[PDB]
Design a protein around this nucleic acid. Structure first.
Ligand SMILES: [Ca+2]
Ligand SMILES: [Ca+2]
Lengths: 152, 152
DNA sequence: GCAAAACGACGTGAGTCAGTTTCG
DNA sequence: CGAAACTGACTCACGTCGTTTTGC
């Protein structure tokens, strides 16, 4: 559990509100109990000629990694534990994505419960819909309504 | 000559490195002694549905305004001296556009003498080429090069 | 004659997902 | 099984200028 400097968090919260992304997804995957994986992702996108900035975040956040997708690169942090510790500290400084940040935090906290019950998992999927709605979601396919139909 | 709150500046700098833009332009205009106006502009672009964020900036920076362009809107600050005061205080916290911010300040401090000497005017235009160089310039037409219309 | 506002647009540089695979 | 990586791409939401006009 790394403790982050407020100055670094204040700046990062602004950069995140600008070019960052707090994403919650429901991925159909037949190897999971309820046939769907609950995926959470903290992302920061930037032109690849500026990847040093993203490479810099890896070092300062102390976790995560950068992937190059061509003309653009992404800083990615998926690990649940480090994501919770990070978002807890960043959250109070966010202005545009504070809500989704808190929704993610809530989900990580209900993960073990979600795995125990179909109605809890369904409820959590509902947390996901709200995050998507808060974002500028444009190509979403799997919603909680998709997960419900899975019943029988 | 307002003094801004440190934390407000930390966040804004991040947001600026994210969705902002420090623009320097040489705009051809016959009413000017040297046939070109030196234009400087601080801009923050955002989806129109999130215009509220841009309106809040107007109040917190205490100068400037927001313009609508359809799906997107912009917070714009062109006033030379308030811009200088603003950038001076923001500059120390920028990480991706700190260079262009300093160039703009340097350009401002030098405006009064560039109008005096044709060669000074050209050197300062060099400053705007540099700023464009630092940004992700893609549709630029007027450079210190074209300003060699001075040779006459 | 120049500061500052108005108005418009190119070509991305992002955001926000989807789908498939890995392996403790 | 399930956390986390890996590979992929749609649809913009931006960035970064250009031209023209207002106005003291
Ligand atoms: Ca943005
Ligand atoms: Ca950006």
């Amino acid at each position: 559990n790394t403790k982050y400097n407020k100055e670094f968090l204040l700046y990062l919260a602004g950069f995140v509100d600008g070019d960052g992304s707090i994403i919650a997804q429901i991925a159909p995957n037949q190897s999971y109990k309820f046939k769907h994986q609950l995926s959470l992702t903290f992302v920061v996108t930037q032109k690849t000629q500026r990847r040093w900035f993203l490479d810099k975040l890896v070092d300062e956040i102390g976790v995560g990694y950068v992937r190059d997708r061509g003309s653009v690169s992404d800083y990615i942090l998926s690990e649940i534990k480090p994501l919770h510790n990070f978002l807890t500290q960043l959250q109070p400084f966010l202005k545009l994505k504070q809500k989704q940040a808190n929704l993610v935090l809530k989900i990580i906290e209900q993960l073990p419960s979600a795995k125990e019950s179909p109605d809890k998992f369904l409820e959590v999927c509902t947390w996901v819909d709200q995050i998507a709605a808060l974002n500028d979601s444009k190509t979403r396919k799997t919603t909680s309504e998709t997960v419900r139909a899975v019943l029988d």
